[PDB]
Amino acid sequence: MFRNNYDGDTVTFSPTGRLFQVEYALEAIKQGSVTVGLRSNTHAVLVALKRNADELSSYQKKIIKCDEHMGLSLAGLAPDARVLSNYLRQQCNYSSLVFNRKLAVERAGHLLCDKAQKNTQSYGGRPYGVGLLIIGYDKSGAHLLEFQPSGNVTELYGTAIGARSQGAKTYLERTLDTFIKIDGNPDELIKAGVEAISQSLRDESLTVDNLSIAIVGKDTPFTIYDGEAVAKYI
C-alpha cells in the first residue's frame, strides 16, 4: 500500500535527499539489548544488558577491547560488530608500530567514519547494521563517542543505545551534573550507569549474568566486569 522505490540499494537517493537503506541500518540498533555509556572529567563507563535465546544458552558478548586506552559496546549486529572492532584494533596496533603513540580516540572516530561512509557510497554491499559506543582516555582526558553507522560520530557526556533506550537516555539527561563531576570515586559513576540502564528494564531485573560493566580513565586501563565482579554493582 505504500511502496518505497528508493530503498533497494545503498547508493540510491530519495527525491528528498534521504538514504533510506542507511536509515534502516539505524533501525537495526533498536534490535539490540540496551547499553549505556557515560563520562565524568576523568573516567568513561559502559554498562550493557546481555540477552540469551533460551535459559540453557550462554549470554551474548557486548563489550569489546581494542587497546589498553579504549574499547566499545555494540547494540546492533554482533557479527558485523566484529568487523569494526577488528579494524579498530588493527588501527591501534598500526599507531603503536608506525607512529609510536597510541591512537587518540577522536582519531579512532575519524577512521570508523571513513570506513562506514565507504560502505554507504559504493554498490555491491550494505550499510553497517550496528551502532557503537566507544569509550577512551588519552592526553585530552575522558572521552565518549557515539558512532552511528551512517558514517557519523559525536562527542557526548553520555548516551544509551538499543531497544527501550529513551528511558535510560532521559535519566542520564535528568541526572547529568550528577555523573560529570564524579571523578576520583569511579564506583558511583558505575552506580549512575546502573540506575540509567535500570530505567530501560520494564520490570525485568539486573542479574549477576545478565549485566556487564567496563571502565577506562586515568591510570586504570580499559577493564571488563562479569559474574560476581558485577554483583557488588547490582
Binding site: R3, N4, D7, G8, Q21, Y24, A25, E27, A28, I29, K30, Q31, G76, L77, G125, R126, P127, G129
Partner: peptide
Amino acid sequence: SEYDRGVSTFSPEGRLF
C-alpha cells in the same frame, strides 16, 4: 511483505530476511 526476498538489504526494522 515487500521486504521479503531481499538480499543484502535491511527491512524498515533492519531485518535481513
